[PDB]
């Protein structure tokens, strides 16, 4: 009848009663996210309020056990979680009010629509309407209209919501003894009570900023090189020392420069590494895509997707009729129900994203065995990294020739390697300044360093300063351009994409030793490598039972994140860009903007 024995029993009783109620909440949230109606929001609201009231009930019990008396840290960590108070602290009105705010933004993003000025009866959603424009259009004004109208007609709707969202999210965080909501989010990386492996929430900022400074020179030359090619694409619209206009970047916010490959390819005469045309030419559908991703994980010893996956997942836009959150989401609903929601198109982009969000699923499956509260990635960065391990191997030309998307005569040469490296760089390098900048803006807004008065002022200052991107149209404080992105608007921490980008090369480095691939790291393609998969698996099955600092060392041999593997990947491109830019400016001035005054 010791305290530790009582807590084990109390967690066990919790783990068994908890599973179904979470499953119900997941199951209702699935209905809304697949099919936005007013009714499904009510049902989703009820399921989550039922689950929240359960936690508040258990939290009250959990808070009665003296935390410090628990010896085994695996048990101690579960008990610690159950004492959190979470959102229960919010008064009932303030609690219902924030839930209503979040649902209103969630719907606005996925169902907001801007109508054509010449014809007001033809209106366009974000997906597929506006995303397609930003991803394949070569006309400046068309891209400008899509970019600006989405910000002005939808972003301005989100502004008064985000304002009150910050206030309530701050209330809740500071009541759980965090310094702001940004602190709460950073607590995901926190490690406590483990000698030599602890990680302070403050340490995360130091590391992100310290690592970032080593990325700047690579990015600057990528930036300088893209601006050079862009200056030919859009003749009179680009300054040779200025920042890049935001709407010319390849997608809606310039998060991934991927679609700029067509304008920025180094060697156009060499066969195309963008297999989008081959996929279309070979009549691939989304079924073929996910089956080729399933086939991949199996090649390294991982399991097939469950029958319930193929049965219940939404892998194509349901149609005009049913209104769905078209953003790629990977779903662990509990009780062995795994699903993917993604409005797949026949592109190399979606082909690679299928491997990404399916890697997400494999991780969910691997740690299914853990006790309820430990079913989760080691940290947000780990989870968002497993898929990009695969995306790294799948995108390689050797793998693409392997699955028939490249002609069987195509053989690699140096121009081919550069082409591949450049495309990988547009996706992977380009997002790092974008990602870091955004999260810094939120952390400053949440902390209170940016007043409500200067949100959009300071936002675009940092876009020019850090990302090297300028707005094509001056935006006053009626806007809320951060909220126009899925993560900002749907309440998801974004720093998880920065850390995952450093993680994925550390993991790749350790896996290409396990497959004993010799050569440069950018030709790895771990496939048919049971030895590699088993090394990766042995870390996934742990879930969150071990601190990520430890689990990361178990694979790569590193207590912390490092950029050396990332820069070693792109090293051959790095020297190449330096030589291409010898007669071009590198860097930018914050002052030039593509408009008056």
């Amino acid at each position: 009848s010791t305290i530790e024995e009582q807590v084990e029993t109390f967690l066990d009783n919790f783990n068994h009663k908890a599973e179904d109620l979470f499953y119900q909440s997941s199951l209702a949230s699935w209905n809304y996210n697949t099919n936005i109606t007013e009714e499904n929001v009510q049902n989703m609201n009820i399921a989550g309020d039922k689950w929240s009231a359960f936690l508040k009930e258990q939290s009250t019990f959990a808070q009665m056990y003296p935390l410090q008396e628990i010896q085994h840290l695996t048990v101690k960590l579960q008990l610690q979680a159950l004492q959190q108070n979470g959102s229960s602290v919010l008064s009932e009105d303030k609690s219902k009010r924030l839930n209503t705010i979040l649902n209103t933004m969630s719907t606005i993003y996925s169902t907001g629509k801007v109508c054509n000025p010449d014809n007001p009866q033809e209106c366009l959603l974000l997906e597929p309407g506006l995303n397609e424009i930003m991803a394949n259009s070569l006309d400046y004004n068309e891209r400008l209209w899509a970019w600006e109208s989405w910000r002005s007609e939808v972003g301005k709707q989100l502004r008064p919501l985000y304002e009150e969202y910050v206030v309530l999210k701050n209330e809740m965080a500071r009541a759980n003894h965090y310094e702001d909501y940004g602190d709460y989010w950073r607590g995901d990386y926190e490690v406590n009570g483990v000698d030599g492996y602890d990680y302070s929430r403050g340490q995360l900022i130091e590391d992100v900023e310290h690592t970032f400074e080593e990325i700047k020179p690579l990015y600057e030359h990528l930036h300088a090189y893209v601006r050079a090619k862009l200056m030919n694409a859009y003749p009179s619209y680009i300054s040779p020392i200025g920042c890049l206009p935001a709407h010319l970047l390849g997608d809606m916010w310039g998060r991934f420069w991927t679609n700029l490959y067509s304008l920025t390819v180094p060697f156009g005469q060499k066969p195309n590494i963008d297999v989008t045309d081959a996929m279309v030419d070979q009549a691939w559908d989304a079924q073929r895509i996910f089956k080729e991703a399933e086939k991949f994980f199996v090649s390294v010893g991982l399991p097939n997707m469950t029958q319930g996956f193929w049965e219940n997942s939404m892998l194509t836009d349901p149609g005009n009729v049913q209104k769905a959150v078209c953003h790629p989401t990977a779903w662990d609903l509990g009780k062995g129900d795994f699903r993917i929601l993604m409005c797949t198109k026949v592109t190399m982009d979606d082909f690679l994203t299928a491997h990404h969000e399916m890697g997400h699923i494999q991780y969910d499956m691997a740690y299914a065995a853990q006790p309820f509260l430990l079913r989760n990635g080691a940290n947000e960065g780990f989870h968002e990294a497993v898929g990009e391990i695969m995306s790294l191997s799948a995108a390689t030309p050797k793998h693409l020739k392997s699955i028939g998307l490249l002609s069987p005569d195509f053989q690699e040469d140096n121009e081919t390697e550069i082409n591949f490296l450049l495309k990988q760089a547009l996706t992977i390098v380009g997002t790092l300044p974008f990602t870091y900048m955004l999260e810094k803006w939120r952390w400053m807004v949440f902390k209170g360093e940016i007043p409500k008065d200067q949100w959009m002022k300071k936002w675009w200052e940092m876009k020019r300063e850090i990302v090297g991107v300028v707005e094509p149209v001056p935006h006053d404080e009626t806007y809320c351009d951060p909220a126009s992105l899925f993560h900002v608007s749907n309440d998801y921490s974004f720093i998880r994409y920065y850390t995952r980008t450093l993680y994925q090369f550390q993991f790749q480095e350790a896996l290409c030793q396990a497959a004993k691939h010799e050569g440069p790291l950018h030709k790895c393609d771990i496939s048919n490598s049971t030895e590699a998969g088993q090394k990766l698996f042995n870390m996934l099955r742990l879930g969150k039972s071990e601190p990520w600092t430890l689990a990361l060392e178990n694979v790569v041999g590193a207590k912390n994140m490092n950029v050396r593997p990332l820069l070693n990947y792109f090293e051959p491109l790095f020297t190449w860009l330096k030589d291409q830019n010898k007669n071009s400016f590198v860097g930018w001035s914050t002052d030039w903007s593509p408009y008056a005054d």
């Binding site: 066990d12 068994h16 179904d20 499953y23 009780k335 062995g336």
Partner: protein, 196 residues
């Protein structure tokens, strides 16, 4: 006597019992062709212990028992001699050396309804483990603390029965499997069950 065994009554039953209160029916005065069971091939798990099925057909007993109940898929592994876990500790314990057979099949289409089927229970807590073939249906509130419970749930006081949640969408491990455990007995009394 040449009455074929009412196996169809147990294996094809409209409804099965919750595992914590498993249901056993005695088969008497009957001729049992055991091969026709394995030759239905519907079953996912069909393991026999302490006897060979081939030899089992040409063999007589004073009485045969069939214990039926339902549990989760990944919990079927606990219906085997010398096993530990939530089911074999507080619900249905087979002896370590056991003569009998364990039969199970996926019951998803039958016992899981949309929205959830909760009528299926399982014992979650008990003071001590079950002896083999012991059966417990006490509804007294488990007490984990020095503080008494007064017959109600509360702090360190948990109602000992939990409810299974079966939806069609669950993973195979969480899906409902139906289990039939075949006991044989030999008394100082005339055998009433044989094969051809």
């Amino acid at each position: 006597i040449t009455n074929l065994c009412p196996f169809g009554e147990v294996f094809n039953a409209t409804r099965f019992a919750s595992v914590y209160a498993w249901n056993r029916k005695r088969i008497s005065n009957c001729v049992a062709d055991y091969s026709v069971l394995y030759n239905s091939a519907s079953f996912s798990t069909f393991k026999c212990y302490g006897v060979s099925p081939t030899k089992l057909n040409d063999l007589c007993f004073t009485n045969v028992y069939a214990d039926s109940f339902v549990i989760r898929g990944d919990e079927v592994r606990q219906i085997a001699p010398g096993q530990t876990g939530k089911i074999a500790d507080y619900n249905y314990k087979l002896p370590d050396d056991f003569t009998g057979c364990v039969i199970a099949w996926n019951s998803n289409n039958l016992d899981s309804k949309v929205g959830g089927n909760y009528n299926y229970l399982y014992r979650l807590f008990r003071k001590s483990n079950l002896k083999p073939f012991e059966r417990d249906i006490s509804t007294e509130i488990y007490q984990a603390g020095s503080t008494p419970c007064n017959g109600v749930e509360g702090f360190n006081c948990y109602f000992p029965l939990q409810s299974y949640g079966f939806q069609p969408t669950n993973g195979v491990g969480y899906q409902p499997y139906r289990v039939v455990v075949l006991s044989f007995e030999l008394l100082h009394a005339p055998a009433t069950v044989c094969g051809p």
